[PDB]
């Protein structure tokens, strides 16, 4: 029975946590809330739903078929392809194990049932939950870190001067700043501000006491924590800083009451020697004591809108509040409490078919040449967030609500709950961790934000301007010759300010950094004065004979020269470089030529080249390749492709080589390969990365510092790329397998399995093409190969041996 | 020393283990995944799901890439049900002779070693290990088995003595 027979005029005593415990009994949880004391429990169940669909033929004790409306999963189904999908039919999960007749009286079928996964409220009195106050007084503090032979136990509070630091291996020894660096001599000014949650005074001056066997220490933790307990009321919470060791949350030794979720996530990830503590390791105590009232500060505001305080996923995954929000408003208008597998979503088989589109805009508009210069910069952010404001579909109509309702609750002033929310949202519709039928609404907002940013692109026209680039994050602008932040300054106010109106909010712009003159065709090949030079395709030139400095210095000369007419202007200039450069590229490749051939260390000179991971080309005599590039960045630098095209036939002529040959014709060098839509932890946001571009001999050591997310300098790590290759792979051989065929002769595909004709006497082909695979299994190898992914390189060489 | 030197410890992946994916047949996880196993545990094999056990004088295959549900779920007109369902799917899989009688979206398969998922002729025992519930029948003096999702189904593991041509019916939710 309950707590008081009394319930009905229910006793405002709100909750601090809901603890499930299945362990104990099948269902059973205890609820732990508050009176005048820092706490008190009850032990309770509830009816978990099953929504069995079917009280007809199959039956339990109750014939609960109600309220039939809650469509969504029904809705969801069409992954799973069925038709006339009325809402539902329900019963408790009286046991582990499924009636295998699986049917429905609504419409016959087959369905998931599964649905109750966490409990939120009680069913059998509930509160209006305002005022919920979750704050206990009263607690023990708390820290758990280590490094393997030097590990850091802490107890600290200000009730007490007493505090305790031990566990090592060096049985010798002791740790030495565990007094005169414990104590801080450094009291924090925001404890004032943030001190009223707390009943003593934050205090940080502190002595300790020492233990060493690993047999001693976690009992003698357990019986010091359980009598220090006793000095404050009996009763009480364990108030853990952290526990980045051994992930001491779960593993700890049993508290007897709640543990909360005080701990913060493992941002300083400190593994170094343990010596260094001086004001640093104080703060990393000190500091996380004022984190106590932060972490809970945020706990409870964030339980101000969805009513869980202390045992709340926030600072995790924390899609718990867009999910629970997302659930109940899918209450006020009944549709669903969702599922939540491993898995993406909320139904049972698949057609593989509509996963090919998670088995498998951004325009480079690369003016070479530079007219309306300026300086030419622009940057977007929260896009998808702007994206959703502007439109079964009822549930995509709540997101825009729920969106609306977050960013209404970012305050006039200041807040940061919502803020770090909306960004969640940023992130969360990128994730692949996320759920909810999550690929539909990945897809929503990819669909709906190319629309978005094709108005926003496409709408410049009307003020004189032009687009040298644009991306989701980065976008290039040019709209006159003089007067560079002036005549920035009218277009991109002017455009930000209607693009919100007409998109009912697109202001996060922001434009600030230099590029006076730029030459871009992606950085694969640019150059710029501010003089910055940045051509992938150099990194493929040799060293040898200079052939990288000598494309550096025509480049350079070029680009100079022409900025030098365009000063002192501030059209025809390109035909007089182009003679400068008729003397000195034939004398550059003269030299260059005569160098390399009577250079005798050359084995072939196909050795000659350097490698990187994006390397595919068969580079054979690196004049031509000289030549090759640098006609290549003048044929596009300039309309006016005349002269370059005499230039090519002249020096492919010094070089005896012929024109209109394989080998006369540019390719890119770089076979690149980009991973989209990478997310940051340190930021929440969001970037594509190139894994074939980069220069991997100046980075081997710090590749995953080079693959840096853009909004910080924080890495993208090997482990976790790797691992998203290997998924990557399996997905596109996913798609592989499951290919179309097409006829050649028609181009229609083929219908049904037997034939091995079409109706017409036409053979049929592959419509994904195995030389495809082969190229990107070939540009994976090479990826894996430089930066050491032997799991990747173990299903490739699989892969790569069960061929022909 | 004595099960460490006689008995045979052979894994078969399926869809949820590392690497490759639900393709058939279901290739073996990596082997740094398997070395450290296999170094101190000669006695032990890391191989294919399917897979083909020949005894002195028996034969038997292998298999757990899931499909009883699948079978029941796309019937042409209706399912046949009750206790009878794995005699029905066991008819279905003996007739069809083919360990995925069913779509390739559904159940996909590399297309040039689709030979190798044969049930012809026919093995001596069918140890079809799906998620579903555990159950032994037979025909055309064929055994066929399934042991079952062991932790839902009462702790329901199964063990076959070819020499006796039997096989026990266990539950070990009284260990």
Request: with cysteine; aromatic share 12%; proline share 6%.
């Amino acid at each position: 029975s309950f707590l008081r027979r009394t319930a009905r005029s229910i006793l405002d005593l709100p909750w601090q946590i809901v603890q499930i415990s299945e362990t104990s009994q099948a269902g059973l949880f205890r609820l732990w809330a508050l009176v005048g004391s820092d706490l008190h429990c009850i032990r309770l169940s509830i009816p978990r739903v099953f929504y069995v669909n079917q009280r007809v033929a199959k039956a339990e004790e109750g014939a609960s078929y109600r309220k039939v409306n809650r469509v969504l999963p029904r809705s969801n189904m069409v992954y799973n392809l069925y038709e006339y999908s009325v809402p539902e039919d329900m019963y408790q999960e009286h046991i582990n194990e499924i009636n295998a007749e699986l049917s429905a009286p609504d419409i016959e079928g087959v369905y998931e049932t599964q649905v109750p996964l966490l409990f939120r409220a009680l069913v059998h009195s509930l509160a209006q939950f305002s005022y919920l106050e979750p704050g206990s007084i009263r607690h023990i503090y708390l820290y758990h870190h280590a490094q393997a032979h030097k590990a850091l136990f802490g107890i600290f509070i200000p009730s007490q001067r007493r505090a305790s630091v031990f566990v090592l291996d060096t049985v010798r020894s002791n740790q030495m700043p565990s007094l005169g660096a414990l104590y801080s001599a450094e009291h924090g000014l925001l404890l004032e501000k943030v001190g009223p949650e707390l009943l003593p005074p934050p205090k940080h001056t502190f002595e300790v006491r020492a233990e060493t066997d690993l047999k001693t220490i976690c009992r003698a933790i357990q019986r010091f924590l359980l009598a220090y307990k006793e000095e404050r009321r009996g009763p009480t919470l364990i108030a853990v800083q952290s526990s980045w060791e051994l992930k001491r949350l779960a593993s700890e030794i049993p508290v007897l009451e709640e543990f909360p979720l005080v701990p913060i996530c493992v941002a300083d990830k400190i593994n170094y020697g343990v010596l260094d503590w001086q004001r640093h390791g104080a703060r990393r105590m000190i500091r996380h004591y004022l984190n106590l009232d932060t972490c809970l500060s945020q706990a409870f505001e964030m339980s101000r809108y969805f009513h869980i305080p202390i045992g709340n996923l926030p600072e995790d995954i924390s899609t718990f509040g867009s999910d629970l929000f997302f659930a109940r408003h899918l209450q006020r208008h009944n549709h669903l409490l969702w599922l939540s597998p491993t898995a993406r979503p909320d139904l049972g088989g698949k057609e593989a078919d509509d996963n090919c589109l998670v088995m498998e805009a951004t325009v480079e508009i690369n003016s070479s040449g530079c007219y309306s210069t300026v300086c030419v910069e622009l940057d977007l952010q929260n896009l998808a967030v702007n994206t959703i404001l502007q439109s079964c579909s009822n549930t995509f109509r709540i997101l825009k609500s729920m969106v609306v309702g977050w960013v209404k609750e970012i305050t006039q002033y200041h807040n940061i709950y919502a803020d770090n929310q909306v960004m969640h949202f940023y992130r969360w519709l990128r994730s692949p961790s996320s759920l909810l039928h999550d690929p539909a609404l990945h897809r929503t907002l990819h669909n709906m934000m190319k629309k978005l940013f094709l108005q926003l692109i496409a709408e410049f026209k009307r003020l004189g301007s032009s687009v040298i680039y644009a991306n989701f994050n980065r976008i290039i602008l040019c709209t006159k010759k003089r007067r560079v932040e002036d005549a920035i300054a009218y277009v991109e106010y002017i455009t930000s300010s209607i693009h919100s109106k007409e998109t009912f909010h697109s202001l996060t712009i922001s434009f600030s950094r230099c590029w006076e003159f730029l030459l871009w065709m992606d950085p694969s090949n640019y150059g710029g004065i501010k003089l910055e030079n940045n051509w992938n395709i150099l990194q493929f030139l040799p060293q040898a004979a200079s052939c990288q400095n000598y494309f550096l210095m025509i480049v350079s000369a070029y680009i100079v020269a022409v900025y030098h007419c365009m000063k002192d202007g501030l059209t025809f200039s390109q035909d007089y470089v182009a003679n400068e450069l008729t003397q000195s590229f034939f004398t550059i490749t003269q030299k260059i030529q005569k160098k390399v051939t009577g250079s005798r260390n050359s084995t072939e000179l196909s050795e000659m080249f350097p490698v990187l991971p994006g390397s595919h080309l068969l580079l054979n005599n690196p004049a031509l390749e000289f030549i090759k590039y640098v006609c290549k960045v003048l044929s596009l630098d300039t309309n006016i492709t005349n002269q370059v095209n005499k230039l090519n036939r002249d020096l492919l002529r010094l070089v005896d080589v012929g024109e209109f040959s394989e080998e006369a014709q540019f390719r890119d060098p770089c076979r690149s390969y980009v991973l989209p839509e990478v997310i940051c932890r340190s930021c929440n946001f969001c970037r594509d990365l190139d894994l074939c571009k980069d220069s991997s001999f100046s980075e081997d050591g710090a590749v995953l510092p080079q693959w840096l997310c853009s909004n910080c300098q924080a890495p993208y790590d090997s482990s976790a790329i790797e691992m998203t290759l290997v998924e990557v792979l399996q997905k596109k051989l996913m798609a592989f397998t499951l290919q179309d065929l097409v006829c050649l002769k028609c181009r229609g595909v083929k219908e049904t399995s037997m034939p091995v004709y079409c109706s017409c006497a036409g053979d049929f082909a592959l419509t994904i093409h195995t030389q495809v695979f082969m190229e990107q299994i070939g540009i994976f190898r090479n990826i894996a190969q430089h930066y050491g992914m032997s799991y990747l390189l173990e299903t490739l060489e699989w892969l790569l041996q069960k061929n022909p | 020393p004595d099960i460490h030197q006689s008995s045979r410890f052979v894994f078969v992946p399926g869809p949820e283990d590392p690497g490759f994916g639900s393709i058939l047949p279901r290739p073996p996880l990596a082997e740094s995944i398997t070395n450290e196993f296999r170094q101190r545990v000669p006695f032990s094999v890391f191989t294919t799901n399917p897979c083909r056990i020949q005894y002195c004088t028996q034969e038997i295959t292998v298999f757990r890439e899931d499909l009883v549900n699948k079978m029941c779920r796309n019937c042409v007109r209706f399912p046949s049900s009750n206790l009878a369902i794995p005699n029905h799917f066991v008819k279905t899989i003996l007739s069809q002779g083919h360990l995925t009688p069913l779509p390739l979206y559904v159940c996909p398969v590399y297309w040039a070693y689709d030979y190798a998922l044969r049930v012809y002729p026919v093995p001596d025992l069918l140890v079809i290990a799906d998620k579903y519930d555990p159950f032994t029948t037979t025909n055309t003096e064929c055994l066929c088995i399934n042991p079952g999702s062991f932790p839902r189904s009462g702790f329901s593991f199964k063990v076959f003595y070819p020499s006796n041509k039997t096989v026990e019916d266990s539950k070990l939710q009284g260990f």
